[PDB]
Amino acid sequence: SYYIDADLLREIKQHLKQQQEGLSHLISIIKD
Amino acid sequence: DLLREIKQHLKQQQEGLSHLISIIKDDMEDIKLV
Amino acid sequence: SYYIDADLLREIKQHLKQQQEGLSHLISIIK
Amino acid sequence: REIKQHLKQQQEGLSHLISIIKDDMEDIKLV
């Protein structure tokens, strides 16, 4: 089968966590 | 219904993002050594 | 030397593209 | 529309995300 370096999962998750915090802040804004 | 709409789309975006994060977390338990 | 199935990275990529489409939509809904 | 421009910030986020994934998918290993 075909494989890629797993370290990339780490990076992606980290960023998505931020992009997630951003959205929550964004919606909490308009809610305020 | 202008802010409602924006707000609704943001909630959907946030759902999709959470879904992707759960997919990644599941992937993170199928790592293989080579 | 640790790996994951390459298909799993493709799946992520498609979801990221969907996120992008939805994000460009909001931005366009202000336009 | 600091919101709009707050979204632009995020959409650029995904772009990086996607770009970095694309580069890694040029380095796939077959077993």
Curated annotation (Swiss-Prot), chain A:
Free-text description of this protein's post-translational modifications in UniProt: O-glycosylated.
Localization annotation: Nucleus, Nuclear pore complex; Nucleus membrane
Top-level taxonomic group: Eukaryota
Signal peptide bounds: none
Cited function: Component of the nuclear pore complex, a complex required for the trafficking across the nuclear membrane.
Recorded disease: Dystonia 37, early-onset, with striatal lesions: A form of dystonia, a disorder defined by the presence of sustained involuntary muscle contraction, often leading to abnormal postures. DYT37 is an autosomal recessive form characterized by the onset of progressive dystonia, dysphagia, and choreoathetosis in the first months or years of life. Affected individuals show delayed motor development and may have impaired intellectual development.
Subunit-level organization: Component of the p62 complex, a complex composed of NUP62, NUP54, and the isoform p58 and isoform p45 of NUP58. Interacts with NUTF2.
Record remark on domains: Contains FG repeats.
UniProt similarity note: Belongs to the NUP54 family.
Identification of the protein by name: Nucleoporin p54
Span of the entire protein shown here: 453 to 483 of 507
